[PDB]
Design a protein around this ligand. Structure first.
Ligand SMILES: *[C@@H]1O[C@H](CO[C@@H]2O[C@@H](C)[C@@H](O)[C@@H](O)[C@@H]2O)[C@@H](O[C@@H]2O[C@H](CO)[C@@H](O[C@@H]3O[C@H](CO[C@H]4O[C@H](CO)[C@@H](O[C@@H]5O[C@H](CO)[C@@H](O)[C@H](O)[C@H]5NC(C)=O)[C@H](O)[C@@H]4O)[C@@H](O)[C@H](O[C@H]4O[C@H](CO)[C@@H](O[C@@H]5O[C@H](CO)[C@@H](O[C@@H]6O[C@H](CO)[C@H](O)[C@H](O)[C@H]6O)[C@H](O)[C@H]5NC(C)=O)[C@H](O)[C@@H]4O)[C@@H]3O)[C@H](O)[C@H]2NC(C)=O)[C@H](O)[C@H]1NC(C)=O
Ligand SMILES: *[C@@H]1O[C@H](CO[C@@H]2O[C@@H](C)[C@@H](O)[C@@H](O)[C@@H]2O)[C@@H](O)[C@H](O)[C@H]1NC(C)=O
Ligand SMILES: *[C@@H]1O[C@H](CO[C@@H]2O[C@@H](C)[C@@H](O)[C@@H](O)[C@@H]2O)[C@@H](O)[C@H](O)[C@H]1NC(C)=O
Ligand code: NAG
Ligand code: MAN
Ligand code: MAN
Ligand code: MAN
Ligand code: MAN
Ligand code: MAN
Ligand code: MAN
Ligand code: CA
Ligand code: CA
Ligand code: CA
Ligand code: CA
Ligand code: CA
Ligand code: CA
Ligand code: CA
Ligand code: CA
Ligand code: CA
Ligand code: CA
Ligand code: CA
Ligand code: CA
Ligand code: CA
Ligand code: CA
Ligand code: CA
Ligand code: CA
Ligand code: CA
Ligand code: CA
Lengths: 414, 415
């Protein structure tokens, strides 16, 4: 004979009316010297022989008695002596939902990279439940968010294990860290729950390119500026963090000609490497390029205009027509000369002068092109030779003067 | 107006610039009669005057880049003077640039570090080639050595200067081709064109685009019940196609939703060790899942099934319930006692047999499964023996064999 009864029933519960089930008289139970025999460690059942009833001595717990084995049936044998008779009886215990779903870890750590595409699965630790069947784990739900959703798998021996599925791509630049609530629901009535915290750490991915604060840099620097002069400092910013955010500055020269400028890849400072000359090159158009450790780059145009400095003296060049000059020759051209100046503005503008005492005349024929002509015929006895010191001088600040001497002799017939 | 003569660069000295006498409309004798002379700003005479044949010649070879450079046009303003009578003429000499310079790149080798997940259409700035020439004689085109992942584009800017930029058309893969080498060539527009090559070495940056994979899809291992605590069961290894911090793997143990399991995993080596005690009579079969995870989130999973082995570590449990301490003399078929045997083990380790002495006139009769009875085989007088000893000996059929015995003394009555 076999009897069935729910788990965790209070001790002293009336199991079965043994007297009626055996079809024997009430006094016969104590008459035959009814005893109970079993190899169990604990005597779960005590026999009331006077009323012929089978009673529980202690409160049973299925998980501690059977555990994983199902059905939980305990076999024992009751013996009678008058006459000698044996009766094997089995007792089955129906499992109840008296266990709450418990997660292994109080928090689960997930480090998901930013470029993780939707549909990507992530394994989660399952909630365990010592119960059996519908009283065990049945459902898994995740706290309402816009990124993930959990799905339950009944793989293998019908043991349910949850895994998290991504639906919308992550972004560390928007939300660095996620915190979800993983809830496990039982299939019993009423259902039992078990909650844990899913900690999602979004790993940074270099998906952002560095950009300069200014698209154009325009700075003026004098020609006579000292070596290692701070021309301009350039700054670029990256939206990413760590090594993925570090930038490296590189100088791209424009067209031909050497660039006397150097950039620091770290600080972003542009400084003088060589010499500057407004007369050689007055305007530089270059491009600074900041690049991360990934290859993503940003570019900016830097324009540097050199300032003019009066550091050039006028170049006086003279070609003589007549080494000697007749006495009674009116209006004679002694020599013709031209002046030069690479500078600009008043630094390039130049006025030339001659001694006022000399009977000669400077006649400006062409632009920066003068002629030295005698103003009147000359006698020999007065002055044999003449030292004419032409002095060309610019109108800049400071003023630079260049002068040259020519000797002209007046001569009649030999 | 003033007169101007044009002449290509790098012309050999002694070149016939122009018939100056005819251009000025003067007689052949008149030019040398008036003492025609040449005046220019430079000390170095670039021009020399031939008053005999009335021609203008070159005294030095002109270099446009050394005279003008970037300025255009390269015009030298010079003057011609006459002395019979005194007269002044303005004349200009323009030097047409010639394609006499090779395009050169500043650096012999340019290093690029491009990500593996770089999307097509991504631009990568490259340093331009230098050319002191002007117009069509400067840098005009940019071509890149035949590859599969890149193509160069020639862009113009500001003063219509040409600069190259590299364009990706096919995504890279460090697991396929870690490093790439290109030849960047710059082509002139002159005739014939002139090239300028340089190394462009592209180093593919690693991106975590590989998930860890287990060598085996299933792991099976037998472990004895008597095995010690914290003993290495099996070592699992997973490989990652990536490298560096994107390649190192961390192992995690995932158990079933049934009950607690006595096992632990090493994150580095991948060794599974025992955590608690093992008993075949408790839990016989274990199914766990090992999950390998990198530093990016990409994972791989393998199923590890371990069944424990049964050992004969449980002696049979004998429990005897006696009915009669004393027995009648001439009583046939008398039931002395009734006992039960147990064995939690399985197979021959659980199978058990019971024995009694051969000299005793008692018979051991089986009534129920693993449940026997001690009954007299035949009546017997007292004068032979007053009391008898019955040592029930129960033993399993395992290896080694475990035995357990217990004695019961029974007396006869009625004299
Ligand atoms: C069926 O099996 C039975 C069970 O056997 C058991 O299983 C086997 C495998 C063995 O493990 C065995 O040990 C188990 O018991 C058998 O029953 C038992 O049988 C044994 C032996 O047959 C009885 O003796 C017991 O064992 C000791 C024997 O010692 C042996 O070794 C030594 C040294 O090798 C050797 O000693 C030498 O003996 C000779 C001869 O005397 C001497 O000349 C030598 O000098 C001496 N050597 C030296 C160095 O000195 C022996 O020859 C053996 O080989 C024995 O010592 C031991 O004695 C103690 O333990 C018992 C415990 O029961 C005590 O008995 C109780 O004492 C109480 C106190 O006086 C007494 O109370 C009195 O009660 C009465 C009324 O009842 C009155 O009221 C008084 O006022 C009270 O004081 C109790 O009544 C008494 N118990 C009984 C039942 O009467 C004893 O005093 C002492 O403390 C021990 O006796 C053994 O007794 C016996 N078991 C029982 C319960 O009786 C049975 O024999 C088998 N069947 C057959 C047919 O054989
Ligand atoms: C598992 O649970 C899913 C989510 O149900 C939600 O949670 C419960 C506690 C209620 O608040 C309910 O209003 C929510 O929608 C269900 O969509 C799904 O069907 C369930 N699966 C099974 C097998 O029951
Ligand atoms: C005219 O100049 C002649 C040349 O002298 C030169 O110029 C002067 C300024 C010094 O620098 C001298 O060392 C040069 O050799 C003179 O010999 C002559 O006396 C000068 N005539 C007059 C009237 O001063
Ligand atoms: C440069 O060369 C390529 C290949 O020969 C050609 O397709 C392209 O039209 C050229 N560009 C110019 C501006 O000539
Ligand atoms: C299980 O338990 C949780 C709270 O722990 C409830 O929110 C849920 O609805 C279910 O009752
Ligand atoms: C599981 O999650 C619930 C969410 O309601 C918490 O209230 C609880 O403390 C446990 O963390
Ligand atoms: C994660 O967060 C939940 C609430 O969101 C806690 O209840 C839990 O203990 C863990 O700290
Ligand atoms: C560019 O092309 C010319 C031929 O047009 C080669 O001679 C030169 O070496 C470079 O490859
Ligand atoms: C540029 O590259 C070409 C081909 O590698 C060489 O031949 C040339 O000398 C220059 O270095
Ligand atoms: C880049 O190109 C140069 C030719 O200038 C080679 O020498 C070098 O090995 C790389 O291919
Ligand atoms: Ca329970
Ligand atoms: Ca439950
Ligand atoms: Ca339960
Ligand atoms: Ca982003
Ligand atoms: Ca990012
Ligand atoms: Ca970046
Ligand atoms: Ca200067
Ligand atoms: Ca200057
Ligand atoms: Ca000046
Ligand atoms: Ca040249
Ligand atoms: Ca060229
Ligand atoms: Ca040239
Ligand atoms: Ca790849
Ligand atoms: Ca990779
Ligand atoms: Ca990886
Ligand atoms: Ca065992
Ligand atoms: Ca065993
Ligand atoms: Ca055994």
């Amino acid at each position: 004979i076999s009897y069935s009864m729910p788990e965790e029933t209070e001790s002293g519960y009336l199991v079965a009316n043994l007297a009626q089930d055996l079809g024997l008289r009430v006094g016969e139970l104590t008459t035959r010297g009814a005893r109970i025999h079993h190899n169990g460690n604990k005597e779960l059942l005590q026999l009331d022989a006077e009323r012929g009833n089978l009673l529980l001595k202690e409160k049973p717990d299925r998980e501690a008695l059977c555990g994983a084995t199902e059905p939980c049936v305990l076999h024992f044998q009751i013996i009678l002596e008058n006459p000698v008779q044996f009766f094997q009886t089995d007792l089955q215990f129906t499992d109840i939902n008296d266990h709450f779903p418990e997660f292994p870890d109080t928090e689960m750590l997930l480090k998901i990279q930013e470029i993780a595409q939707p549909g990507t699965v992530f394994p989660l630790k399952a909630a365990q439940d010592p119960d059996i069947g519908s009283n065990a784990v049945q459902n898994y739900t995740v706290s309402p968010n816009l990124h993930f959703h959990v799905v339950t798998l009944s793989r293998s021996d019908d043991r349910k294990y949850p895994e998290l599925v991504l639906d919308r791509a992550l972004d560390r630049e928007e939300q660095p860290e996620l915190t979800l609530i993983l809830t496990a629901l039982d299939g019993g009535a009423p259902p039992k729950s078990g909650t844990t915290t899913v900690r999602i750490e979004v790993v940074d991915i270099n998906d952002n390119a560095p950009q300069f604060l200014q698209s154009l840099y325009a700075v003026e620097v004098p020609e006579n500026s000292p070596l290692n002069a701070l021309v301009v400092t350039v700054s670029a910013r990256d939206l990413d963090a760590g090594i993925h955010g570090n930038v490296a500055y590189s100088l791209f020269q424009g067209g031909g000609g050497p660039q006397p400028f150097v950039i620091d890849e770290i600080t972003g400072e542009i400084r003088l490497k060589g010499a500057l000359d407004f007369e050689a090159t007055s305007y530089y158009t270059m491009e600074i390029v900041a690049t991360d450790s990934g290859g993503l780059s940003g570019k900016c145009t830097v324009a540097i205009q050199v300032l003019d400095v009066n550091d050039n003296a006028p170049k006086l060049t003279i070609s003589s027509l007549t080494s000697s000059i007749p006495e009674n020759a009116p209006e004679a051209v002694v020599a013709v000369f031209s002046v030069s100046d690479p500078d600009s503005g008043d630094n390039g503008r130049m006025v030339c002068s001659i001694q006022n005492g000399l009977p000669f005349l400077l006649k400006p024929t062409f632009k920066n092109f003068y002629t030295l002509v005698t103003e009147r015929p000359l006698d020999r006895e007065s002055n044999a030779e003449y030292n004419i010191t032409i002095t060309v001088s610019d109108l800049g600040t400071p003023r630079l003067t260049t002068q040259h001497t020519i000797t002209v002799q007046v001569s009649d017939i030999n």
